[PDB]
């Protein structure tokens, strides 16, 4: 319990850096990059018992994952990858690893001041996505 208290709530995307390059590294095609890159998703995080749910709500796509920390699950990403995901807490940071087609990407989420900072890493490319409470 209480593991994710400071993450819970509704968050709105307020800044994005190097997301197109991240998406290129991931293998997202041109048209999806352009439309996905315009989106300003809300992120909705909730907890019930041991189950954490993370939703996106946007113009482009709505996504939803529910999971237990450390327990691998199937995920369909906003760009339509079918991945195997595992999410853990490492020193108060949610660490989300996605595996597909022999590739891997890691998304880290942390609270910093009044923001929720999301760092997406694919090989040598990092993108930073900053959210504030909605
Ligand atoms: C290609 C790609 C890769 C990673 C992506 C997305 C798209 C979208 C998304 C983009 C546009 C619309 C909807 C979802 C979201 C997302 C956003 C918020 C919540 C949960 C996941 N993530 C996680 C990183 C982020 O916070 O941006």
Swiss-Prot record:
GO MF annotation: an example: long-chain fatty acid transmembrane transporter activity
SUPFAM superfamilies to which the protein is assigned, alphabetical: Lipocalins
Q: Which Gene3D superfamilies match?
A: 2.40.128.20
In the record, Phosphotyrosine modifications are located at 22
Q: Got a GO cellular component term for this one?
A: cytoplasm
Q: Which residues carry this modification: N-acetylcysteine?
A: 4
Amino-acid positions noted as binding a fatty acid in the UniProt annotation, renumbered to this chain: 129-131
| Keywords on record | Acetylation, Cytoplasm, Lipid-binding, Nucleus, Phosphoprotein, Transport
| Phosphoserine: residues carrying this PTM | 15
Q: Which PROSITE patterns match?
A: FABP (PS00214)
Q: Where is this motif: Nuclear localization signal?
A: 24-34
InterPro entries registered for this protein in UniProt: Calycin, Fatty_acid-bd, ILBP, Lipocln_cytosolic_FA-bd_dom
Q: Localized where?
A: Cytoplasm; Nucleus
Q: Which Pfam families match?
A: Lipocalin
Q: Name one GO biological process term.
A: cellular response to tumor necrosis factor
Q: How does it assemble?
A: Monomer. Homodimer. Interacts with PPARG.
PANTHER family (alphabetical): FATTY ACID BINDING PROTEIN (PTHR11955)
Free-text comment about domains: Forms a beta-barrel structure that accommodates hydrophobic ligands in its interior.
Task: Give the protein's biological function.
Answer: Lipid transport protein in adipocytes. Binds both long chain fatty acids and retinoic acid. Delivers long-chain fatty acids and retinoic acid to their cognate receptors in the nucleus.
Q: What family does the database annotate?
A: Belongs to the calycin superfamily. Fatty-acid binding protein (FABP) family.
| Listed name of the protein | Fatty acid-binding protein, adipocyte
